[PDB]
Design a protein around this motif. Structure first.
Motif, PDB file in Angstrom:
ATOM      1  N   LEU A 147      46.565  53.504  35.424  1.00 11.00           N
ATOM      2  CA  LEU A 147      46.466  53.516  36.870  1.00 11.00           C
ATOM      3  C   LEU A 147      47.835  53.691  37.496  1.00 11.00           C
ATOM      4  CD1 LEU A 147      44.032  50.628  37.472  1.00 11.00           C
ATOM      5  CD2 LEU A 147      43.494  52.953  37.084  1.00 11.00           C
ATOM      6  N   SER A 148      47.888  54.504  38.540  1.00  9.70           N
ATOM      7  CA  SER A 148      49.130  54.822  39.210  1.00  9.70           C
ATOM      8  C   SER A 148      48.855  54.967  40.695  1.00  9.70           C
ATOM      9  CB  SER A 148      49.745  56.100  38.644  1.00  9.70           C
ATOM     10  OG  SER A 148      48.853  57.193  38.775  1.00  9.70           O
ATOM     11  N   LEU A 169      44.537  54.277  45.187  1.00  8.52           N
ATOM     12  CA  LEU A 169      45.379  53.181  44.738  1.00  8.52           C
ATOM     13  C   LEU A 169      46.749  53.275  45.381  1.00  8.52           C
ATOM     14  CD1 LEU A 169      44.617  52.922  41.044  1.00  8.52           C
ATOM     15  CD2 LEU A 169      43.313  52.129  42.880  1.00  8.52           C
ATOM     16  N   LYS A 170      47.166  52.192  46.026  1.00  5.80           N
ATOM     17  CA  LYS A 170      48.414  52.146  46.765  1.00  5.80           C
ATOM     18  C   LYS A 170      49.486  51.351  46.040  1.00  5.80           C
ATOM     19  CE  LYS A 170      49.040  53.672  50.082  1.00  5.80           C
ATOM     20  NZ  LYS A 170      49.456  55.023  50.438  1.00  5.80           N
ATOM     21  N   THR A 171      49.170  50.121  45.657  1.00  6.00           N
ATOM     22  CA  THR A 171      50.123  49.262  44.980  1.00  6.00           C
ATOM     23  C   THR A 171      49.352  48.153  44.288  1.00  6.00           C
ATOM     24  OG1 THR A 171      52.243  48.109  45.211  1.00  6.00           O
ATOM     25  CG2 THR A 171      50.564  47.627  46.830  1.00  6.00           C
ATOM     26  N   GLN A 172      49.932  47.666  43.206  1.00  6.32           N
ATOM     27  CA  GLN A 172      49.294  46.702  42.334  1.00  6.32           C
ATOM     28  C   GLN A 172      49.726  45.289  42.663  1.00  6.32           C
ATOM     29  OE1 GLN A 172      49.774  47.279  37.893  1.00  6.32           O
ATOM     30  NE2 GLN A 172      50.066  45.090  38.166  1.00  6.32           N
ATOM     31  N   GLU A 192      42.109  40.426  34.201  1.00  5.64           N
ATOM     32  CA  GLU A 192      41.911  41.382  35.271  1.00  5.64           C
ATOM     33  C   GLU A 192      43.222  41.734  35.943  1.00  5.64           C
ATOM     34  OE1 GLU A 192      39.127  39.265  37.741  1.00  5.64           O
ATOM     35  OE2 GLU A 192      40.729  38.616  39.091  1.00  5.64           O
ATOM     36  N   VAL A 193      43.214  42.915  36.534  1.00  4.32           N
ATOM     37  CA  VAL A 193      44.331  43.453  37.285  1.00  4.32           C
ATOM     38  C   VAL A 193      43.780  43.934  38.612  1.00  4.32           C
ATOM     39  CG1 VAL A 193      44.101  45.756  36.384  1.00  4.32           C
ATOM     40  CG2 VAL A 193      46.265  45.004  37.253  1.00  4.32           C
ATOM     41  N   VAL A 194      44.461  43.588  39.693  1.00  3.07           N
ATOM     42  CA  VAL A 194      43.962  43.835  41.033  1.00  3.07           C
ATOM     43  C   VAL A 194      44.874  44.827  41.724  1.00  3.07           C
ATOM     44  CG1 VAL A 194      43.165  42.813  43.116  1.00  3.07           C
ATOM     45  CG2 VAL A 194      43.150  41.500  41.047  1.00  3.07           C
ATOM     46  N   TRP A 195      44.290  45.911  42.203  1.00  2.00           N
ATOM     47  CA  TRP A 195      45.009  46.937  42.929  1.00  2.00           C
ATOM     48  C   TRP A 195      44.587  46.916  44.383  1.00  2.00           C
ATOM     49  CZ3 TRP A 195      48.514  50.829  41.533  1.00  2.00           C
ATOM     50  CH2 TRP A 195      48.909  50.797  40.205  1.00  2.00           C
TER      51      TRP A 195
END
Lengths: 120, 83, 95, 83, 95
Positions: A80-81, A100-103, A111-114
């Motif tokens: 993801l970018s 996707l703007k920033t993580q 989990e990872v939240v964007w």
């Protein structure tokens, strides 16, 4: 000390397995596509866009963020970018396209939240 | 395949015996909440049924054909032989 | 019809006698019958009895004894009345 | 290995006696909440079952083949000898 | 069918008598039977009867004694009626 790190992981995994919805990853260049991703889409209505309070027109946009499982991203080969798009292929989500703007900093094991932006 | 199923059940038995340990000690999880404000509630584990599951697994592992002995599907009633 | 009654009563009796007991258990059958004496060698697939036994059963395993009861109808005054009806036609005493 | 599983059970038994103690004294944690607001709720321990688990472990340790004595599956009904 | 009835009733009786008791315990069998007298030497996996024992059983261990009941059917008016039906064909008195 405790087993809470695993309890938390299993909890998040079950939360995802229950509340996730299918999605499609389309990278910024659209060179690669990855379908049947599971993501959780969090959307809260926002009215934004007026500089300071100059009296400019606001637009209605969401304050929204997408939860992924990291295991799945690694499994499916997803890096993801910024600029990458998430399309919600579930029926009735109108194939909403989320940029996707920033993580958010990864806190926790599963989990990872964007933070993202609706684009359609 | 027999031994692949036997290893499956060996891992499941590991998990189940650990769960039984935590359950009798009072460390079996029924609710979890993270600082994410997200919650998970579980159906409470039962000691009888969990012990019985452990016994199914151990018996299948002991058997030559675990995948059949686990379900016990083709059961038949015990007869008796008299002196 | 009294023949049918006699015979189906006898089948009912034999059936209720056959199932001497029941075990209801989420245990495997192989395990439960082992608790009950299957495979135990009798000295000082089916269960060799050797004297009295005291099974140890895990909780949730209800062992229900089902001793053979007396079947009704036959041997009672009901069958007597049927056979008496028939005797009345054949010109015979019930005895 | 016998002494391997025996040490495993001695350790599990230490945990179990500690929990049985805290349980009778009314110190067994059923619920936890941190100021970070994260939470865990446990299936409460039952004194009977925990005692019986302790007995399993102690009998296995004292036994010559612990892993087999813990489960007891080499099972059979008790017979009687008469004078 | 009368013979089958008699024999399956006798098997039922025997099966019911073998299981003189049953324990429902979450303990291991080796503990439970040791409580009941297994390995106990008689003095002033086979339990040696010596006399009038009082076992101590932990709570959750249930000892259900299962004394031998009278099996029915056989020895009652029912089996008398069966044998009457037969003797009638054989020309005999029930006696």
């Amino acid at each position: 000390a405790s087993n809470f790190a695993a309890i938390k992981a299993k909890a998040r995994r079950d939360v995802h397995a229950s509340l996730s919805v299918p999605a499609r990853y389309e990278n910024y260049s659209q060179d690669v596509i990855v379908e049947d991703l599971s993501v959780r889409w969090h959307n809260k209505i926002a009215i934004m866009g007026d500089l300071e309070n100059g009296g400019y027109a606001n637009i209605v946009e969401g304050i929204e963020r997408i939860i992924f499982t990291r295991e799945e991203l690694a499994v499916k080969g997803v890096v993801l970018s910024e600029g990458d798009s998430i399309i919600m292929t579930a029926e009735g989500y109108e194939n909403a396209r989320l940029v996707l703007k920033t993580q958010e900093p990864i806190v926790g094991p599963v989990e990872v939240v964007w933070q993202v932006a609706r684009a359609d | 395949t027999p031994e692949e199923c036997r290893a499956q059940y060996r891992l499941m038995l590991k998990e189940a015996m650990d769960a039984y340990h935590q359950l009798n000690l009072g460390g079996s999880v029924r609710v979890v909440v993270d600082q994410n404000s997200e919650r998970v509630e579980y159906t409470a584990a039962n000691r009888q049924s969990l012990w019985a599951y452990i016994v199914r697994l151990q018996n299948a592992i002991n058997s030559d054909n675990p995948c059949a002995a686990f379900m016990g599907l083709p059961s038949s009633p015990a007869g008796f032989l008299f002196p | 019809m009294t023949r049918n009654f006699q015979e189906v009563t006898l089948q009912n009796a034999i059936v209720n006698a056959t199932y001497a007991a029941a075990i209801e258990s989420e245990l495997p059958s192989d395990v439960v019958f082992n608790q009950m004496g299957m495979g135990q060698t009798p000295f000082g697939k089916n269960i060799a009895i050797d004297g009295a036994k005291i099974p140890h059963l895990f909780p949730g395993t209800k062992l229900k004894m089902q001793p053979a009861g007396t079947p009704g109808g036959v041997g009672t005054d009901y069958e007597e009345s049927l056979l008496r009806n028939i005797a009345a036609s054949l010109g015979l005493s019930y005895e």
